[PDB]
Amino acid sequence: AACKCDDEGPDIRTAPLTGTVDLGSCNAGWEKCASYYTIIADCCRKKK
């Protein structure tokens, strides 16, 4: 799911809606957009 970013990095492919709702934590190459979102989900941005 598409999440809106606090850490609005230069890599705007789309809109402020760039981050994905990642479960628990974040994956390799996925940096914190909105560090915490909901209960057991955080927003991470796949940035190169």
How many other C-beta atoms are found inside a 10 Å radius of the C-beta of residue 3? 21
User: 7-25 as b/e, with b when 16 or more CB fall inside 10 Å?
Assistant: eeeeeeeeeeebbbebeee
Q: What residues contact 5, with CB distance under 8 A and at least 6 apart?
A: 16, 17, 18, 19, 33, 34, 43, 45
For residue 22, what is the enclosing H or E element?
strand 17-23
State whether residue 3 is helix, strand or coil: strand
Separation in Å, CA 44 to CA 14, 36: 15, 9
How far apart are alpha carbons 36 and 16 in whole angstroms? 16
Amino acid in the structure at residue 27: N
How far apart are alpha carbons 45 and 31 in whole angstroms? 5
Structure solved via: NMR
Give the phi and the psi of residue 44 in degrees, each rounded to 5: -125, 140
Domains assigned to the chain = 1-48 (2.20.20.10)
